[PDB]
């Protein structure tokens, strides 16, 4: 009926191959410091590992990590990806470096590095999405609009099986990287400390004094004097009082935060994907620094 979808450990690999992956990612990220005014390639990879996953219908279990369909040209090109050709580029000769590793496995993996370099949390991570075939591509349009409201997010993230406090927690990714105008008509930084992984998000929603304003893309965004925005559907996120009593707890506990988010982004990444019994269990990589590297 629905596709079924089960993991197969790339044959012959073990932890130790996969944390030389990491750490080639991690490396890399350490030495190309200079992308977009020096934030780094951190806050795109993170997005590329949500955009390859934010394609899951959980009705037919089509879309979603397992395939690594990014690397076909329709989704490669989907206006709503623009912009993630730049994490694509970054992967590429990591993945010519290792080549017995699945397309669906290093996006997701470029995503889980990128968050615990950026001093995140760990994200517990599995291997063993496989790529599939040129057909298997879904269609552009399941990733979502930024113009909307709490009602849109909430019905849009059922669709991947989230809640209301997964989707707060996914949400607080947006402290990361920033809007450019050429990619998605919305310009400028979320706050701060755009490189690194805090609860930053949550606080600038609670204590800005956020104007209403059009942009040079004739979209409206929310501009704080600070000099930050906020899309609509980040906005949104106050305007709800269940979600609001969410980004409340998350200003208040960056510990909570890191928690859920965790959860959030792991089953965000897995969806779709049936993990055998035998499967081995999530892994754990450690950070440059934890390794002395
Ligand atoms: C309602 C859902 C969401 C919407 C409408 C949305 C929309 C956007 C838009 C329009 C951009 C700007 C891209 C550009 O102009 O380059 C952006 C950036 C970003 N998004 Fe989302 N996003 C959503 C959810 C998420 C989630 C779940 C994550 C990961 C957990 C995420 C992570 C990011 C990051 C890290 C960036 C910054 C990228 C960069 O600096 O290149 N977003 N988002």
Same mark, same amino acid.
């Given at each position: 009926?629905?596709?079924?979808?089960?993991?197969?450990?790339?044959?012959?690999?073990?932890?130790?191959?996969?944390?030389?992956?990491?750490?080639?990612?991690?490396?890399?990220?350490?030495?190309?410091? @200079?992308?977009?005014?020096?934030?780094?390639?951190?806050?795109?990879?993170?997005?590329?590992?949500?955009?390859?996953?934010?394609?899951?219908?959980?009705?037919?279990?089509?879309?979603?990590?397992?395939?690594?369909?990014?690397?076909? &040209?329709?989704?490669?090109? =989907?206006?709503?990806?623009?912009?993630?050709?730049?994490?694509?580029?970054?992967?590429?000769?990591?993945?010519? @470096?290792?080549?017995?590793?699945?397309?669906? =496995?290093?996006?997701?993996?470029?995503?889980?590095?990128?968050?615990?370099?950026?001093?995140?949390?760990?994200?517990?991570?599995?291997?063993?999405?496989?790529?599939?075939?040129?057909?298997?591509?879904?269609?552009?349009?399941?990733?979502?609009?930024?113009?909307?409201?709490?009602?849109?997010?909430?019905?849009?993230?059922?669709?991947?099986?989230?809640?209301?406090? @997964?989707?707060? $927690?996914?949400?607080? $990714?947006?402290?990361?990287?920033?809007?450019?105008?050429?990619?998605?008509?919305?310009?400028?930084?979320?706050?701060?400390?755009?490189?690194?992984?805090?609860?930053?998000?949550?606080?600038?929603?609670?204590? @800005?004094?956020?104007?209403?304003?059009?942009?040079?893309?004739?979209?409206?965004?929310?501009?704080?004097?600070?000099?930050?925005?906020?899309?609509?559907?980040?906005?949104?996120?106050?305007?709800?009082?269940?979600?609001?009593?969410?980004?409340?707890?998350?200003?208040? =506990?960056?510990?909570?935060?890191?928690?859920?988010?965790? &959860? $959030? !982004?792991?089953?965000?990444?897995?969806?779709?994907?049936?993990?055998? &019994?035998?499967?081995?269990?999530? !892994?754990?990589?450690?950070?440059?620094?934890?390794?002395?590297?």
């Amino acid at each position: 009926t629905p596709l079924v979808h089960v993991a197969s450990v790339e044959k012959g690999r073990s932890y130790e191959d996969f944390q030389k992956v990491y750490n080639a990612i991690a490396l890399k990220l350490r030495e190309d410091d @200079e992308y977009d005014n020096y934030i780094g390639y951190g806050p795109v990879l993170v997005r590329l590992a949500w955009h390859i996953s934010g394609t899951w219908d959980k009705h037919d279990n089509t879309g979603g990590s397992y395939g690594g369909t990014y690397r076909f &040209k329709k989704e490669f090109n =989907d206006p709503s990806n623009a912009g993630l050709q730049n994490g694509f580029k970054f992967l590429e000769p990591i993945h010519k @470096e290792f080549p017995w590793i699945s397309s669906g =496995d290093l996006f997701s993996l470029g995503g889980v590095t990128a968050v615990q370099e950026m001093q995140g949390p760990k994200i517990p991570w599995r291997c063993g999405r496989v790529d599939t075939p040129e057909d298997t591509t879904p269609d552009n349009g399941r990733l979502p609009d930024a113009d909307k409201d709490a009602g849109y997010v909430r019905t849009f993230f059922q669709r991947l099986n989230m809640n209301d406090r @997964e989707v707060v $927690a996914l949400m607080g $990714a947006h402290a990361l990287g920033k809007t450019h105008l050429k990619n998605s008509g919305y310009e400028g930084p979320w706050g701060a400390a755009n490189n690194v992984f805090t609860n930053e998000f949550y606080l600038n929603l609670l204590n @800005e004094d956020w104007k209403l304003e059009k942009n040079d893309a004739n979209n409206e965004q929310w501009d704080s004097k600070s000099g930050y925005m906020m899309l609509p559907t980040n906005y949104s996120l106050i305007q709800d009082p269940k979600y609001l009593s969410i980004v409340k707890e998350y200003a208040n =506990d960056q510990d909570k935060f890191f928690k859920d988010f965790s &959860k $959030a !982004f792991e089953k965000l990444l897995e969806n779709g994907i049936t993990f055998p &019994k035998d499967a081995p269990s999530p !892994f754990i990589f450690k950070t440059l620094e934890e390794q002395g590297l």
